[PDB]
Amino acid sequence: EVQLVESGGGLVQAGESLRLSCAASTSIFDRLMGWYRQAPGKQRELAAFITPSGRTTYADSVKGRFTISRDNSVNTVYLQMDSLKPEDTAIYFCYYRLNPDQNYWGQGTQVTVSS
């Protein structure tokens, strides 16, 4: 089992940036990482992920705003969101790729961006 542990969330106003992060208890040299956010009332939506090779994919809405990064050395991934806005506020979940049907999930951390 992968002991995912994320961090870097809280209360922020509109127009700021936050660099959250997550770490795993196993080598991430091959698995890819991503992020899911869930707004109040809707489901879990993809935000961005990065492949083991280095290729990155971003959700259309946050295009040109967020940015993901990875580090094999410490087995940790990072996500920096800039120009935060109130609508982006939602519960953010961590992601650990597995067989296409399945995928690991983290506990998620609430990030409420007010005015």
Partner 1 sequence: QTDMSRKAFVFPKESDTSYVSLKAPLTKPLKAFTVCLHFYTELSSTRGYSIFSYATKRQDNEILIFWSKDIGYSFTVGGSEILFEVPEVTVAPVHICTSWESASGIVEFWVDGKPRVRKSLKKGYTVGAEASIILGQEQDSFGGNFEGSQSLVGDIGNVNMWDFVLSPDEINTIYLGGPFSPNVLNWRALKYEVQGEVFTKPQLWP
Query: Which spans of this chain sit near partner 1 (rule: CB under 8 A)?
Result: 29-30, 32, 51-55, 57, 73, 97-102
Instruction: List, in order, residues 6 or more apart from 87 with CB less than 8 Å away.
Output: none
Query: What amino acid occupies position 9?
Result: G
Indicate the residue among 53 and 107 with the shorter CB distance to partner 1: 53
State the CB neighbour count (10 A cutoff) for residue 64. Answer: 8
The least distance separating partner 1 from the CB of residue 53, rounded to whole angstroms, comes to 5
Count CB atoms within 10 A of the CB of residue 52. 14
Q: Quote the least distance from Cβ 90 to partner 1, whole Å.
A: 23
Q: How far is the CB of 57 from partner 1 (least distance, A)?
A: 5
- Distance between CA atoms of 29 and 39, rounded to whole angstroms? 31
- C-beta of 1 vs 30, nearer to partner 1: 30
